[PDB]
Amino acid sequence: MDDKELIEYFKSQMKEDPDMASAVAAIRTLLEFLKRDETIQGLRANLTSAIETLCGVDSSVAVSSGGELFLRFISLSKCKKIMIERGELFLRRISLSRNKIADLCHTFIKDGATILTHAYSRVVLRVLEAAVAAKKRFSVYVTESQPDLSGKKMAKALCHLNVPVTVVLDAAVGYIMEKADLVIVGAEGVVENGGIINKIGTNQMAVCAKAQNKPFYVVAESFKFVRLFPLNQQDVPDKFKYDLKEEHPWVDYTAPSLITLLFTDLGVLTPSAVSDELIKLYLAA
Amino acid sequence: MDDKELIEYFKSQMKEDPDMASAVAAIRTLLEFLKRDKGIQGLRANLTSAIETLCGVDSSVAVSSGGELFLRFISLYSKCKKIMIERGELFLRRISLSRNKIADLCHTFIKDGATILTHAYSRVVLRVLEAAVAAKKRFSVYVTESQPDLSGKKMAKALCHLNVPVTVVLDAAVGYIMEKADLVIVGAEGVVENGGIINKIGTNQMAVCAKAQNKPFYVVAESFKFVRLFPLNQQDVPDKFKYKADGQDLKEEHPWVDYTAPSLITLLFTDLGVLTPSAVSDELIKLYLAA
Amino acid sequence: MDDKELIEYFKSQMKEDPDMASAVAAIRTLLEFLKRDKGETIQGLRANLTSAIETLCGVDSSVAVSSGGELFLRFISKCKKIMIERGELFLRRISLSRNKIADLCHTFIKDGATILTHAYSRVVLRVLEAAVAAKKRFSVYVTESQPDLSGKKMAKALCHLNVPVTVVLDAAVGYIMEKADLVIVGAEGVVENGGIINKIGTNQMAVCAKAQNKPFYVVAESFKFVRLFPLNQQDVPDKFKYKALKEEHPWVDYTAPSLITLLFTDLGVLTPSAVSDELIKLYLAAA
């Protein structure tokens, strides 16, 4: 398969189903590139990793970690295209994650609570969507999240579920914090120490949450567990972030000390237990 | 002089000189109003009062604190002999000194090669940083663009036109950027009795992130901004100061200012001296009583 | 429990014990009223009808009754509520206040010191008791303190601890000042700026001590910390005063922080300017 097509196939997977997580449309586009493509067994384990970076035309870690997890799962006679049935098993397996999570933390969303989130998140949406359809009564505050204003999009979405929701400037988090009971957020990437890479602004929320001792919860699919051990902002590779100057990073890092619990499709986790989980995950035969 | 006149005179003062503190512009037009007022002593009082609040049509704490302090300092045949105007001009002459006293006091704390972080546009911080280039100090700035009026951007150009390196960052990247800073220098719309401050929404966030990384948080502010409020939380800042300033789905949240408690501030640089938050209550009494 | 009961209950708390502070007697009554409020139902109405009673108790102009009362309702965030657990925890702690202050302060009464105090103060009394129990030797001068003469009552109480004491006219304060080593005074309330509202005659005693470099010490409980910031006498609510050929009779005056050296509290020794930080912590207790 071709690169420009590799991209067109990838972008179209997301246009046809907005519901779909970047990473899933990507590990999915590989499954298509694999079928549609043979010669040098090397070109196999090559071209695919020679294209996971190509559709690295996203800049997100989810895509990179989702992809590495995929290529690794479909491993171990040119009929070794058992890989394709492995890939479909892996794609079938990760399409149950959101739901696993949306109900793995129904108990943490308490009736009469005021929830604060940042930007848009397909996973928090399901979590909350699961909460309203379970008759839980709650309110929500969400930052507008510059520059795409995806938090506004998130607000319209919560409105359609008839959930009371207020939009606030990113600069108002410190101010509105005292009004919330807890913070729930998504993750573009769960890092090796349990910290997370997420839409720029997540870090600040976490700090204002800790300062007022509001639990800060995180919900993310296990395919977002990435092989990285950052200790500060600078540690995050620019690949993922992007005299008068301007700096427009897209994601920042939130140390594990600022996280209460991670709700994953592998269960509830304390940030410190994440590393053992990654290796337990790989040791999946 | 009637309301329409006041307002136009007040806005003129600000268009005349954009670097003039909003409060300074205000006491100036109060002084002009007091000069024209053709109305006994009692009248003059509620007259120069039922207009100060009219000037309140700039929901800034400073305009309020400045006016109050002015009426206080100015207050006391007898009629005409009103030595009020004289005191008025004297008061006006001292508060116009303040900004420079702060510049001198503060720049002293900017270590050479330091990266300073700021929020929005602040005239006094601008003067503090000029006092810094003058002291031959080399530094670099990071400033939030500050929604919704993007006043941070305007701050960046001012600095660019002074030749100091300046980088603009999204309000959402303060926690992210904190790492690269040595200290935070922010102005204030008002200084409350407990030492805390009322300022451009976004300020609190910066101070909380600053404290978490043990970065000194400095405030630079003229004393006519000392206001008589003792907030315990955000809900304690009167609404007339946070709204109209400069169904199910609600953007119902557009506060213009926020509150930063005394425990998040390291030092306040004032014309009255370098004060720690606790020391503010004694200076605020001395200020308001001095007369 | 209804209004009749409250006022009766509150009054019989102090009845069964005159040595009790008004705010403590008032706080205990909110605790009973709370308990005897099962007739209520929503966690909201308990907290609501509970505010209705503070006012009722407000029938005791005392500042501490307001602040103690407010602080009480604050330390408490279905039909089944653990608020009472907090209300008793709260009562349990303000009951240690007076004593923490006595063993915190007595240590500062040097041997042979002559102390000057004003009118009657339960806290100042506990303090001196701790000093004679500590085997310290001092003497006291106390203003008779018009119009109720509580100073004379204070004097007799002290005489019964065998502490040498002399009663003097409220007008003889500036006169007697030169023979005092320090001044100790209680407080009806502690204001946001570290200043204090107390029995009329306190202000001038402070100004006088100031002019002779005599240290001036306030000893008071934390439930007396109140949300006020007065710049002069007029700024003191009349609810607490009773005032500003006529006569004036304010029952309390205001003493500025510039006139106080140290405040001895259950939160520790404080300078007036540090009161604002402690008042904040104190009011945002629950967090």
C-alpha A220/C-alpha A262 separation (Å) is 7
How do C216-219 and C268-270 pair as beta strands? unpaired
Task: Tell whether C231 is within 8 A of chain B (Cβ).
Answer: yes
Strands (E), chain A: 114-118, 139-143, 165-168, 182-185, 189-190, 196-199, 216-219, 244-247, 251-254, 261-264, 267-269
- Of B208, B213, B230, nearest to B277 by C-alpha is B230
**Structural contact between residues C222 and C285, judged by C-beta atoms closer than 8 angstroms:** no
CB-based contacts of B254, cutoff 8 Å, min separation 6: A169, B148, B243
As beta bridge partners, residue A190 has A196, A225
Cα C258–Cα C68–Cα C242 angle in degrees, nearest 5: 65
Give contacts of B195 with chain C, Cβ < 8 Å. Answer: 276
Helix (H/G/I), strand (E/B), else coil: C253: strand
CA distance to partner chain A, nearest, from residue B155 (Å): 11
Which residues, numbered 27 to 56 in chain A, qualify as contacts with chain B under a Cβ-Cβ cut-off of 8 Å?
A: none
User: In CATH terms, are C2-94 and C95-287 the same topology?
Assistant: no
DSSP one-letter code for A109: S
Task: Tell whether B83 is within 8 A of chain C (Cβ).
Answer: no
> Can you spell out the DSSP letters for A163-208?
--EEEE-GGGHHHHGGG-SEEEE--SEE-TTS-EEEETTHHHHHHH
Mark yes or no for CB contact B278/C283 under 8 Å.
Answer: no
CA distance to partner chain B, nearest, from residue A206 (Å): 9
Q: Nominal resolution in Å?
A: 2.7
- Paired tokens of C121: 């103060």
Domain ranges of chain B: 2-95, 96-291
CB atoms inside a 10 Å sphere around CB A126: 18
Query: Least CA distance to C227: which residue of chain B?
Result: B230
DSSP one-letter code for B60: -
Q: Name the method of structure determination.
A: X-ray
Among B68, B232, B278, B288, most C C-beta atoms within 10 A, so best to mutate, is: B278
Q: What is the dihedral of CA B70, B73, B75, B77, to 10 degrees?
A: -110
Q: Which fold has domain C2-94?
A: Four Helix Bundle (Hemerythrin (Met), subunit A) (1.20.120)
Write out the H or E segment, with its range, that includes residue B218. strand B217-220
When CB atoms are compared, the residue of B173, B205, B250 closest to A252 is B173
As beta bridge partners, residue A114 has A139
**Structural contact between residues C121 and C146, judged by C-beta atoms closer than 8 angstroms:** no
The CATH architecture of the domain made up of C95-287 is 3-Layer(aba) Sandwich (3.40)
- Paired tokens of A85: 């049935």
When CB atoms are compared, the residue of B166, B176, B208 closest to A244 is B166
Q: Could you tell me which CATH number the domain at B96-291 has? A: 3.40.50.10470
- Paired tokens of A202: 């997540």
Mark yes or no for CB contact B193/C276 under 8 Å.
Answer: yes
**Structural contact between residues C123 and C133, judged by C-beta atoms closer than 8 angstroms:** no
Q: Quick check: bond before A237 cis, omega within 30? A: no
**Structural contact between residues A110 and A136, judged by C-beta atoms closer than 8 angstroms:** yes
Exposed, middle or buried: residue B70 (CB in 10 Å: 0-12, 13-18, 19+)? buried
Alpha helices (H) along chain C: 3-15, 22-35, 43-57, 63-74, 83-105, 122-133, 150-159, 173-176, 202-211, 275-283
- Of A207, A146, A150, nearest to A173 by C-alpha is A207
Distances (CA, A) of C190 to B281, C250, C255, C256, C269: 14, 18, 10, 10, 14
C-alpha B241/C-alpha B257 separation (Å) is 7
The CATH architecture of the domain made up of B2-95 is Up-down Bundle (1.20)
Please tell me the CATH superfamily of domain A95-285, with its number: Translation initiation factor eif-2b; domain 2 (3.40.50.10470)
C-alpha C214/C-alpha C114 separation (Å) is 11
**Structural contact between residues C132 and C109, judged by C-beta atoms closer than 8 angstroms:** no
- Paired tokens of A195: 């910290």
**Structural contact between residues A147 and A116, judged by C-beta atoms closer than 8 angstroms:** no
Give contacts of B147 with chain A, Cβ < 8 Å. Answer: 146, 169-171
Which residues, numbered 155 to 184 in chain B, qualify as contacts with chain A under a Cβ-Cβ cut-off of 8 Å?
A: 156-157, 159-160, 165-177, 179
